[PDB]
Structure formats: structure tokens, C-alpha cells
Design a protein around this nucleic acid. Structure first.
Lengths: 80, 331, 334
RNA sequence: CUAAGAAAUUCACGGCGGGCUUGAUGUCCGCGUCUACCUG
């Protein structure tokens, strides 16, 4: 339920609560109480589609409450 | 045709309680009901910079400037009282039983064939091979995770509370029993048959487990952490039930089921915890790789579908993976 | 090709307790229970503007305005009782052993290379070099950080205990043994033959370390200073808070361990002197700057890569530094 | 002397099974709180 960055990786995973890991210094900011998502390798950034919001890019741009997730995270697939 | 079950999950057996940590003196072991609780308390620290800097930002004038302002954390720790040396860890373990009957299947023929295969497994051999190994990880007190190393003498002690009273008591010594070999003692077979009859289902089994570890005056115990989700900084909050430091009821119990010795490239590297795709994070990598055919899922689907019964040294693994529970459906 | 791991973590050895404090007279031989604690008390200071002023605020009227509204704080302090003169600091040390084996590693070939290399070090030469240098900092009262300076007779007792009863006891004078010379006695080489035995996993070692320091009658000790939060900046706020464990001033369990591993006399800048604490990018904070910089090649993270991967085994006086740092612990990933 | 006048939303429900959050740390150093007072 967001509008991420330009990563076209796979069916991403996302959460808002984020802790910082220190052990294992190739991965930073491991994500907490995380929830699944599927965009199924869609073209553009806005496709998140948890359960209800797939089409309607105008309604997606209206859905800017919890959006603009940076995506640069523990994995090119996994988003913020 | 018996295709795979779309949604299948299992209720666990072998539930552990939460672990309590108390403190005292070693000579007062046999009257240790009212030992005070190892409380958590806040302290402050002051770190430095001890991480591998990258090749670009290795300037000389920047490193001393970055360590001129250190990072003042605020750590919670737990120490024993300065007059006490022996750490008492108490938790209770209940043995449910009926390990085959699932929680939420889809096909009735899958569920009936699953219960038929598990009934054959309990019919030919007992749970005795899968209970002489749980009794070990109650004996050599692996559930003391980091409090075990460097302990002087670890006396573990286990009671059978059938009624409110005790039925039959047991004392061990967790360093006479090694952390690698699975020996055969006279008082790890009266316990192993008890967990065997508890898992088969011929009674009810509730076990009180206390474990005294001799660490020393004023030393530092280790309980389990928590999350620090979302300045006023803090790091490393420990987990206390009612201001008594506590090990989680799944970090305990994770040491109950490090049983798995039957896995490839076993170089005497000791048992690991039972898991589907049987893996440990501390070793970094994941054994029982699915490209090998010695997994769990491709061991269940070749035993409940096509009936190719694997070796008995893997039917001791599949049933134990059923005992821990979990989800197993195409989620 | 073999490269370094991404997860590396080593548990500490040389486990220190928290240094408890007490006070009493001399004739300290029966100080086991009667000696009360050093209770942290509050007081009330009233400062004056003592820092440096900038090019701005060089006005006499502004300075008089700052002075006539003085600063008022509520510090804490801990003194001895006014009929005693000796501060007693007691803590128990435990050395674990198995100093090479990590607790989290990814690549098993890298772990086997490390456990081959540390084993070649240990079978080559014992822990008897590092155990002597720890027995010095346990022998003289280095761990009395500021309570040491300006004392008279800092008698350090060390018990080694196998059970509740004591196996073997020693008593040193902390002022015969200096603070920058690791000169071997007939007792410190008997203590290194216990610390090196504990560090090689040959048994259990529990050292109850007690240190008496006669500062003077009713004088002022220094326990370890905690940190106060960002509270309301008013006139009456606490400005200094001491650490305390059930109504007794104390020193932190890393303020001991920063003193114990003051080992490294192998940094290249020997223009000054002093055994600094062992650190990666080996640096002391009171001096501010950083020895063992990665600009030169004398670091720790360059040395482990040059020792384990490429097998450029460095000099012995640098090879002690790596193993002492692995005794300390930390994370050393990629 | 009113964007005044007018108005029944209702019935029933299985959230549920599983888990290792680890490793390490130096908080330092300096200080003037004064002057008074009728409780019947």
C-alpha cells in the first residue's frame, strides 16, 4: 500500500516498523513485524497490492498517507 | 490420486513455560523456594568506533574526529547479587501427545493417510528413540544457552508433578553428560520412557525443571532480549516477566529440540535444531538443502503420497518435525 | 577464491564483575563483612562561569550579568566515612577459554582457516605472553582508575577459588609494580601460569580480586559516573550521577575491563609512552587521537586479512595484538 | 418566523497454527548558594 522506488525485483515484502541490526555487517535495518505483498514484476513503482489496491493509479496517487517508501533496504527485493 | 494438502498446519507438543531466573548460594540448594529474583536494571556505557570502515572514507583527520564524539548508549544488564553465586533457572514443561492428528487439513484422504503412516511409525517402533534424545537436552542443560559456558558445576533437577505433589524426582549433573554424545544411563531411561508415554498418549506429563549453574559472586547472567522499536536512546532491553529476568519460551525449547544428528556432511559438528530445511542461523548456512533429497517436505511427500518409506534414521526426523508444529501448506 | 565472512562475532573472555566499594581503617585483614558501603550522597554546588568565551560576549556588563545570575546545580558525591581512610574495591573475574572459536560465522571454510591459524598460534607459543600482561594489570591496581592516583599503600589481594573455599591466595603491593614496565616477578609468573591455563581451556578460573587503597581520612573517592537524560534545564537539576548497586557506589563492569586489557605497547608512535588499551584502530579517548590508523598498515583489520587469507604472518609483537583483540570480542564482518 | 417543517438501518458469525534477536563498549573534569524575620 505505497508507491516505492524503481526496483522491478519480485513480489516485495514491506513493513513500517524498522529496527537496526549491527551483527552481520552486510545487511542493515532488518524489518520488524513484516507483511507480505505481491506486485508480480509490474512495470512501475506504485504497484504494491496488498489485498485491495492494484489498478487505479489516480487512487494510488491519492493513497499517499503511508507512501514514498525508499526501498533501499536489506535486499533489492525487500522494501521499507 | 492423493495430491498434496493445500493448507496443513500442526499444533505443537512439548510446550515449555517461561523461564525464571533466581539467585542464591550453592549450599542452600535443597531449600531454594524463596530465592530472590535476578532483577533487571539500567546502566550506562560509552562505546567507540569498532566497525570495518570502507576503502574510501579512511581519511586520518576524520577517524579521530568521529571517535572524539563517542556513542553513549544505555544498556540494560542483569547481574547476580554480590553475595550470591549460583543462578537458578526454573521452568515447567508439559507433554501433550497425539503427534499425528493435524490442526487444519483440506483433503480427508490426505489426513487419513497421514494418520495411518504415523500410526505405523508408532506401531513398529516406539517414541523411545525420539525420547532418549529429548531427555538428554533436559539433562545436559542446553536450555541455559549462554549461561552454560564457564560454569563450575551445573546441577539440573527435574520433578514429576502429577498432582500438586511430586511423583518421582531426578537429579543430574550437566557436565558429566556431554554436549555431543547421547549416552545411555539408568536415570535417562526412566525419564525417556516418561516422555515416551507422554508423547504416545498414555497419560499426562508435567515436569518441573530447575537448573542451578555456578557462575560466581557478582557475575553476569544472560536473559533474552526484546525489540527496541522506535533523542532518548536505549539499546539491548532484556525481557522480564514481572521484574524477574527471563528466557523466552521459544529460546528455551529451541534447546529442547536440537536433536538432529541425521543430516549430510555431518563431520562430528554436533546436533542442530530440527527444522524444515533444517537450518541454523549461527552457522550462517542451511543444511538439508532441497537439491538434496534429504529435506523435510520431500521426505513427507515421498512417504504419505508414494509410500517410499525412507530410512529409520529419517523417520526419527520427520516425526520430530511434526512434533514442533508449524505451517506446511502452500501459503 | 576465499574471502572474508560477512558475520563474525566472538564472545568476550576475561569476564569482569561490577566493582563494589567499601570503606574502613587499616588492619584490613578481617574486612569480609563489617565494612559498610560507600553510600552515594547529594550536595549542592554553586558554580561560576569558568569556560572559554568567544570573540563575542567580551563585554564587562554582560559578564557581570552572567555572574550576578549564578549557576546552581545538584551534583552527587561519595566520600568515605570520616573515621576511615581506606577504600576497598572488590570484584570477581572469570576467564572462559577457547579464545579462537567464534559464535557466528557464515563461510565454514573461513571458520576452518581461522581455527587452523589460531591453533598454529597457540601450539607455537602459549598464552604466557598475554597472561603476564593481564597479570600486571591485575597485580598493580590499574583498575582503580582515579582512586589510585595519590595514595599510600594499595594492597591488592587476589584469591583463586575452586569451590566456596579458596584454593590459593596472593597479596601484591601496587606501588612496587609500576605502570609502564612489565617486569617479571616470582608471583606474576605464577599468575600467568593460571591465566594462560584458563585461556587454553585447561580448567576453570575464578579470581576474587580485592584491592585496598589508603587515600586518607574522610577523603573523596570516585566511582563511575553515569549519564543523566535530557531533562528540564532548570536551576536544581542533577548534573552528575554516580553508579550504584543496592546502596553502594560502584564502578562499571566495563570500567574494569578497559583497565585490564591495557596491553598494547606495540603501536608505532612511541614518542610518548604508556600501555594503551587494546582496540581495533587502537585508540584511547582521553588522548583523543587514534593510533594504529589504517593509513599506515599497522591496523587490526588489515592484519587479520593479511594473516588469515594471504598468510603474511606478521611480527610476534604484532601477533599478540590480534589474539588479545579476539579475546576482547566484537563484530568484524564485511 | 431559523436551506424551519419529516423520518426505526436491522438480523448471524471459530482468526489460527509456528518461531534463537544475537556480539562488544571508559562518561569525563571544574564549582561559595548567601542576607534577614515575634507563629497568641
Amino acid at each position: 500500500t505505497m508507491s516505492t522506488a524503481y526496483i522491478i525485483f519480485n513480489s516485495s515484502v514491506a513493513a513500517v516498523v524498522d529496527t537496526e541490526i549491527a551483527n552481520g555487517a552486510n545487511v542493515t535495518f532488518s524489518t520488524v513485524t513484516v507483511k507480505e505483498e505481491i506486485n508480480a514484476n509490474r512495470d512501475f513503482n506504485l504497484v504494491n497490492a496488498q489485498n485491495g489496491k492494484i489498478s487505479r493509479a489516480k487512487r494510488w496517487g491519492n493513497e499517499a498517507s503511508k507512501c514514498e517508501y525508499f526501498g533501499r533496504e536489506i535486499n533489492p527485493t525487500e522494501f521499507f | 490420486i492423493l495430491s498434496t494438502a493445500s493448507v496443513l498446519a500442526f499444533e505443537r507438543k512439548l510446550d515449555p513455560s517461561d523461564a525464571l531466573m533466581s539467585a542464591g548460594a550453592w549450599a542452600q540448594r535443597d531449600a531454594s523456594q524463596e530465592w530472590p529474583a535476578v532483577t533487571v536494571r539500567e546502566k550506562s556505557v560509552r562505546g567507540t568506533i569498532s566497525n570495518r570502515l570502507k576503502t574510501k572514507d579512511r581519511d586520518p583527520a576524520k577517524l579521530d574526529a568521529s571517535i572524539q564524539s563517542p556513542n553513549l548508549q544505555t544498556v540494560d544488564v542483569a547481574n547476580l547479587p554480590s553475595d550470591a553465586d549460583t543462578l537458578k533457572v526454573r521452568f515447567t514443561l508439559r507433554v501433550l501427545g497425539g503427534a499425528g492428528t493435524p490442526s487444519a487439513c483440506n483433503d480427508a484422504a490426505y489426513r487419513d493417510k497421514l494418520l495411518q503412516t504415523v500410526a505405523t511409525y508408532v506401531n513398529d517402533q516406539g517414541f523411545a528413540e525420539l525420547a532418549r534424545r529429548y531427555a538428554h537436552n533436559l539433562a545436559n542443560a542446553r536450555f541455559l544457552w549462554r549461561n552454560r559456558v564457564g560454569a563450575e558445576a551445573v546441577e539440573v533437577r527435574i520433578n514429576h508433578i502429577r498432582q500438586g505433589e511430586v511423583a518421582r524426582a531426578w537429579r543430574f549433573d550437566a557436565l558429566a553428560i556431554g554436549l555431543r554424545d547421547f549416552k545411555a544411563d539408568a536415570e535417562l531411561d526412566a525419564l525417556a520412557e516418561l516422555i515416551a508415554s507422554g508423547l504416545s498418549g498414555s497419560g499426562h506429563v508435567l515436569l518441573e525443571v530447575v537448573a542451578f549453574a555456578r557462575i560466581g559472586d557478582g557475575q553476569e547472567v544472560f536473559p533474552s532480549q526484546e525489540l527496541i522499536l522506535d533523542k532518548g536512546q536505549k539499546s539491548k532491553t532484556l525481557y522480564s516477566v514481572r521484574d524477574a529476568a527471563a528466557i523466552h519460551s521459544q529460546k528455551i525449547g529451541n534447546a529442547l529440540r536440537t536433536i538432529d544428528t541425521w543430516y549430510p556432511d555431518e563431520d562430528g559438528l554436533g546436533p542442530i535444531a530440527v527444522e524444515p530445511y533444517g537450518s541454523v542461523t549461527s552457522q550462517g548456512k542451511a543444511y538439508r538443502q532441497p537439491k538434496q533429497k534429504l529435506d523435510f517436505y520431500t521426505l513427507l511427500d515421498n512417504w504419505v503420497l508414494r509410500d517410499e518409506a525412507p530410512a529409520v534414521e529419517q523417520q526419527h526426523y520427520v516425526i520430530a518435525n511434526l512434533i514442533r508444529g508449524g505451517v506446511f501448506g502452500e501459503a
